[PDB]
Amino acid sequence: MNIFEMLRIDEGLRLKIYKDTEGYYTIGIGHLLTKSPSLNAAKSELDKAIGRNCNGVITKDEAEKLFNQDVDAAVRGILRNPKLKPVYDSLDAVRRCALINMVFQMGETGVAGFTNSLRMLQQKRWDEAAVNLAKSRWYNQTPNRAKRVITTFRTGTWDAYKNL
């Protein structure tokens, strides 16, 4: 299993504009288009992103290209972030995937706000960090996905996804 397969399980694939769990306009593999309420603002961002008139719809290929960009940007974002980089560098390969997943869902800024949990991961206190991570709006709002990520940090294995 790898970061791409992981995220593909968590976000799904939709070729028509849709609303995400938070009500925002998204497309493809969890690609946020805008937090704006206008479907029109969404269709415009979409065409801007693809470089064609899409009329709210995209192909598989297009969805996958956006996905490649997004994963790349998530990684680069962690690497440039002074709060995130040290954590990432201290992690093994599987747990690295768990941090990337959080950044992709919630943005650099959002994850960087998990100060205490970040500290526990850095210290390799797996059980403690898992319990701390769960005390968040993130966990309460998307519990099944949060649990999968949390178990990934807890165990350092892909068990939570070997099901799926």
Per-residue CA distances from 148 to 121, 135, 139, 155 (Å)? 16, 15, 10, 11
Please state the three-class secondary structure of 66-110 as a single string.
HHHHHHHHHHHHHHHCCCCHHHHHHCCHHHHHHHHHHHHHHHHHH
Residue ranges of the annotated binding site for substrate are 32, 104, 117, 132
Query: Which tokens hold the place of 149?
Result: 């990520």
CA dist., res. 134 & res. 143, Å (int): 9
Decide if 33 contacts 49 (C-beta within 8 A). yes
Please report, in range form, the residues annotated as the binding site.
Answer: 32, 104, 117, 132
Helix (H, G, I), strand (E, B) or coil at 22: coil
Q: Name the resolution in angstroms.
A: 1.7
Question: What token pair was written down for 148?
Answer: 């999968």
Q: Which has the closest alpha carbon to 111: 143, 91, 87, 90?
A: 87
What token pair was written down for 104? 């992709």
Residues acting as catalytic residues: 11, 20
Place of tokens 């350092």: 156
Place of tokens 């206190």: 125
DSSP state of 123: T
Chain centre to alpha carbon of residue 29 = 10
Q: Residue 108 is which amino acid?
A: E
Contact 153, 133 (CB under 8 A): yes
Q: 3-class SS at 116?
A: helix
Query: DSSP 3-state assignment of 141?
Result: helix
CA distance 66 to 89: 26
| Spatial CA neighbour of 4 closest among 91, 84, 97, 112 | 97
All domains of the chain in start order, with CATH: 1-164 (1.10.530.40)
User: What Cα–Cα distance (Å) separates residue 147 from each residue in 143, 144, 154?
Assistant: 6, 5, 10
